[PDB]
Design a binder for this molecule. Sequence first.
Ligand code: HEM
Ligand code: HEM
Ligand code: HEM
Ligand code: HEM
Ligand SMILES: [Fe+2]
Ligand SMILES: [Fe+2]
Ligand SMILES: [Fe+2]
Ligand SMILES: [Fe+2]
Ligand SMILES: [Fe+2]
Ligand SMILES: [Fe+2]
Ligand SMILES: [Fe+2]
Ligand SMILES: [Fe+2]
Ligand SMILES: [Fe+2]
Ligand SMILES: [Fe+2]
Ligand SMILES: [Fe+2]
Ligand SMILES: [Fe+2]
Ligand SMILES: [Fe+2]
Ligand SMILES: [Fe+2]
Ligand SMILES: [Fe+2]
Ligand SMILES: [Mg+2]
Ligand SMILES: [Mg+2]
Ligand SMILES: [Mg+2]
Ligand SMILES: [Mg+2]
Ligand SMILES: [Mg+2]
Ligand SMILES: [Mg+2]
Ligand SMILES: [Mg+2]
Ligand SMILES: [Mg+2]
Ligand SMILES: [Mg+2]
Ligand SMILES: [Mg+2]
Lengths: 155, 155, 155, 155, 155, 155, 155
Amino acid sequence: MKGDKIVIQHLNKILGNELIAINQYFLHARMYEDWGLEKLGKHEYHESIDEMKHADKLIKRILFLEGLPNLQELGKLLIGEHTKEMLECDLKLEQAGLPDLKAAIAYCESVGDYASRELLEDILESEEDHIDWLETQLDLIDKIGLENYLQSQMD
Amino acid sequence: MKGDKIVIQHLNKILGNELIAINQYFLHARMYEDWGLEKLGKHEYHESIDEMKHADKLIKRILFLEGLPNLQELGKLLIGEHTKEMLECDLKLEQAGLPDLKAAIAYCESVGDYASRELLEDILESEEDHIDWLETQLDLIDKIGLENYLQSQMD
Amino acid sequence: MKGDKIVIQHLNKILGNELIAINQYFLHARMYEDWGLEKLGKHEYHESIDEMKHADKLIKRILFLEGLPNLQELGKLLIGEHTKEMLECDLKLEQAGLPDLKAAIAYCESVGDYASRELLEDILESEEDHIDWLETQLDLIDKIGLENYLQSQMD
Amino acid sequence: MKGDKIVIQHLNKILGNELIAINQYFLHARMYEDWGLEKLGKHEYHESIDEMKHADKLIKRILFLEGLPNLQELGKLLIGEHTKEMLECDLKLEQAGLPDLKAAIAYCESVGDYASRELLEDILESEEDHIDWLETQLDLIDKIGLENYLQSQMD
Amino acid sequence: MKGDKIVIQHLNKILGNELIAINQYFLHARMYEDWGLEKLGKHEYHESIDEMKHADKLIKRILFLEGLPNLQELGKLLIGEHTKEMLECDLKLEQAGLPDLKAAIAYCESVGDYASRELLEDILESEEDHIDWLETQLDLIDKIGLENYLQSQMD
Amino acid sequence: MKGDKIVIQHLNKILGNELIAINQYFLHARMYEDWGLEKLGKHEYHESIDEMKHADKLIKRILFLEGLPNLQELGKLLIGEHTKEMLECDLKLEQAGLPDLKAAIAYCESVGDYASRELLEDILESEEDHIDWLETQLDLIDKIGLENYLQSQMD
Amino acid sequence: MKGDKIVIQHLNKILGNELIAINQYFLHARMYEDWGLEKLGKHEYHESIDEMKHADKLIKRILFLEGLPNLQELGKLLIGEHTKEMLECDLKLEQAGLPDLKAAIAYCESVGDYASRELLEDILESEEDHIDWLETQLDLIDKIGLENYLQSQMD
Ligand code: HEM
Ligand code: HEM
Ligand code: HEM
Ligand code: HEM
Ligand SMILES: [Fe+2]
Ligand SMILES: [Fe+2]
Ligand SMILES: [Fe+2]
Ligand SMILES: [Fe+2]
Ligand SMILES: [Fe+2]
Ligand SMILES: [Fe+2]
Ligand SMILES: [Fe+2]
Ligand SMILES: [Fe+2]
Ligand SMILES: [Fe+2]
Ligand SMILES: [Fe+2]
Ligand SMILES: [Fe+2]
Ligand SMILES: [Fe+2]
Ligand SMILES: [Fe+2]
Ligand SMILES: [Fe+2]
Ligand SMILES: [Fe+2]
Ligand SMILES: [Mg+2]
Ligand SMILES: [Mg+2]
Ligand SMILES: [Mg+2]
Ligand SMILES: [Mg+2]
Ligand SMILES: [Mg+2]
Ligand SMILES: [Mg+2]
Ligand SMILES: [Mg+2]
Ligand SMILES: [Mg+2]
Ligand SMILES: [Mg+2]
Ligand SMILES: [Mg+2]
């Protein structure tokens, strides 16, 4: 079914964001495991698979709407060098993508593509949760100290 | 453990190849499913997951060797527009990568990084299998005809 | 138990035929599977196993009759290059041999080696089946066309 | 996937060795059982099967590499007349072949056919094992005497 | 159903042979157990029950053919005094009966009593196996020595 | 099977290193347990057992090659007095043994003892893993402090 | 808890004897296995493990008593070249260590280290059991002959 040109453009924009998250989180996930911080690596890993599922949903929607998915463009990955910076980079990435998801939902609504809006709504609800976990870890670090926090992420 | 500079460089090259394969196959996988070719989609999908595992192993090895994994650079995906073309694009991708894996195995041997060579050999074996499956599909299209081949890929 | 000289010679002759069949069908089996024709590969593989079993039975009988089994001689192998040809070559073998089993049975009866006759009897009944199956495949190719036939042998 | 002509030639040479082993062991196995040496018969039988599996793997690799399997030529079979001799004949074959697998692995290395090398390595590890068992049986005969050794192979 | 007079005479001849085997093997079986050679006694015992089943089949066939079974005539039992002689006596008995079974099958064929021939065929196949086991034990005795052989027959 | 003289020397060299590791890791494991650092104790213990298994494999290969395993010369054990130092002693031992293993693999490859090379490659993979774990524990101590690190090792 | 200096010296002496036994028996175990004497190998193997457990108990006791376990000194291994010699080597070892164990027990009693005495009594009971088995094997060899004995150790 021929979809709205601007909607497909919006969906592709979002897909691009997801692909960046996929790579960033997978790399951060393995860096954590490499450092022996198994709990962070596991969670970071799960988030990576989550973003992978988000991208998959966008890809399927774009193809149904008869658009051409863009798996070619890969934006700037924000790779940190230590735990605090890595959590901040992931937080910065998620927060940098919100205006995009909200702008996409708003556009879909304006053109009546209610099903695309629903898909984006599900993704947004998940992104606000990831931001929640991230903000929480950063706050935990400040309340208990970096050494205790990292100690708690070992097993 | 500080790894050999040229070996890590080789591992990053291969990683870049795997990342390309990941994206190309996942897009082809969903394009197949989108067209109702379930069997091709399922097989294409699993190949994508396999390349994902290959990339994961390289990333883990690079980090142990104290190198910096490059998930930032993404080569040109070869996206086909119809089945025969998609099969040929995937075959071409795997064939362009062989010289790379063999060159890496050869280099690892020359410098004594036998563990890295073993990882690469495991990937090479899998790669020669995918090429086998791909060459086989193209040969099948030739023997039974495109219409019959696509019919056989529906369920 | 000293067996009849001519019977043992007949037995060794049939054994040579079996060893030929074993190798021919095993090569054909792997060629089919190499081309992605699983169904043909499975059947041919089973037939190869059946011939192996026949050879085993002849070998055992020969040894009991105090003769020397000859696994040294291997007659011409009739290797085909395509499905239709491979089917015809296998059919030719199952036929070129038929007169041998019948002649051995006739000889055993004439010299009173009723046990050897029964063993050959069992093999004969099985041989007339591989032939039945082979004749059927060729007639099937004629009724539905090579492309449809090959398609049906993929999975 | 076209393989190196010399590699395929080596593969065919090894395949010829395997086919000789298969037949020699199958005959020895049935000779053992015919004499009431059940244990010896079972081992030889299994060893015959393993050689069949080796031949099968070579045949598959050759086909994939786009070469033509030679199941036609069968070399000299070394048939023994009694236990001690049969063990020695099997040992010669298992040794005489060693140079071959080692030469093939060496050639595969030099031309970068690492997958073929690994297939040959698997077979090689197994061959050094059949040799071990054979050398042991002969050393055992020397330590306990032929009469005791044969008694121990009855049931 | 009125059977052929000569066939019934042949069947009675065979029954007589079976009855001799029954008694000879049962006696030899218990002598073995009496000497503590449980493995020989068990096998010898099983053979006795086997001959008992052969006789039973002949008896049933003779009665259907409306003949009078002769359980009255009992030929000369060949009782040995030691293991080697006992195995030879059993061997001599089985070999002395073959010409009779083969002559019976030949006669049945000449007069069209195909069902009687089938019954005799089953018995012949079993007798050639008993002869096999016997010849084997005698050969085993010569290869490993009488003391080792008897030792192996204790449990 | 008479193996290469220098290969055997190489294998005995690696065996010598393994024996040192066995004793060093076992004493360290029991020291950790004695101090109530159960987790560290369990891990050190299992590494001790893995080194015992490496020694075993080397001994078996040396015997097969008809060489004489040397379990008489015990090299210098590097025994620590506190966690940080024990991890460092184990790391130093592991690092000192790498050049030997790689030199042995290189030599086996040069004379065609491909099976010995494989055994050594297996051991090498395990050694690099232990080094990875060791380096990680030391990095962890520096990131969360020794007190936290040790607390996490109590159970 | 600070242990008696001389008690610890005795414990280290016994530990040294255990370390000799461990290596001697493990090598003998694999030699038996190497020659196909599985039964002897399995037993020798288990005894090697029992000595490993004795050493473990000694090490733990020494550490509790705040002494330094000595795993650096390795005494003269008594390696045999054939079964009878290996059994005698192990017997000589066990016999040589017996006076040492009894001297250690006597000393512990004199200084009131009853728990250390308990541990030594447990080990002594086990050592006298190995001596019993060893003496019995050598007596069995004289009673049934070396050839029969070795035959019985194959499985
Ligand atoms: C940096 C590139 C990537 C890496 C390193 C990676 C790695 C992985 C790994 C290790 C798994 C687990 C597979 C398993 O063990 O079963 C996985 C699963 C998967 N990936 Fe990726 N992946 C990458 C990119 C992608 C992309 C771009 C997509 C989407 C187009 C994607 C979609 C999926 C899906 C759908 C699954 C299965 C998720 C599930 O369990 O439901 N991946 N990936
Ligand atoms: C020429 C003499 C041969 C004889 C007498 C023989 C006999 C046998 C027998 C009796 C079996 C076991 C069947 C069963 O019980 O299911 C067997 C299995 C098998 N044979 Fe052969 N064989 C021969 C040659 C070969 C050759 C030349 C090949 C390869 C081209 C081959 C490949 C196989 C395979 C792959 C199996 C499967 C075994 C398993 O998966 O466990 N055989 N053979
Ligand atoms: C020397 C004379 C014989 C002796 C010592 C003898 C002894 C035995 C013994 C001990 C059994 C096992 C019974 C049980 O424990 O269940 C048996 C079974 C039997 N006997 Fe006999 N028997 C003799 C003669 C015969 C004869 C002459 C015939 C045939 C007319 C015969 C036919 C059978 C049958 C049919 C069975 C059962 C076999 C089965 O299990 O299928 N026996 N006999
Ligand atoms: C200080 C010297 C040694 C000590 C204290 C020691 C200790 C141990 C302990 C406590 C076990 C576990 C036994 C159980 O509870 O089942 C064991 C197992 C084992 N040890 Fe040792 N050992 C030593 C030396 C060796 C040596 C030198 C070898 C051989 C070259 C060796 C080979 C083995 C093997 C194969 C096992 C069994 C591993 C398995 O579970 O698969 N050990 N050892
Ligand atoms: Fe997302
Ligand atoms: Fe997110
Ligand atoms: Fe890959
Ligand atoms: Fe691939
Ligand atoms: Fe056949
Ligand atoms: Fe056939
Ligand atoms: Fe082989
Ligand atoms: Fe072999
Ligand atoms: Fe009978
Ligand atoms: Fe009989
Ligand atoms: Fe090791
Ligand atoms: Fe290690
Ligand atoms: Fe002990
Ligand atoms: Fe002991
Ligand atoms: Fe004996
Ligand atoms: Mg559509
Ligand atoms: Mg590290
Ligand atoms: Mg390898
Ligand atoms: Mg015979
Ligand atoms: Mg019939
Ligand atoms: Mg192909
Ligand atoms: Mg009636
Ligand atoms: Mg040996
Ligand atoms: Mg303490
Ligand atoms: Mg007490």
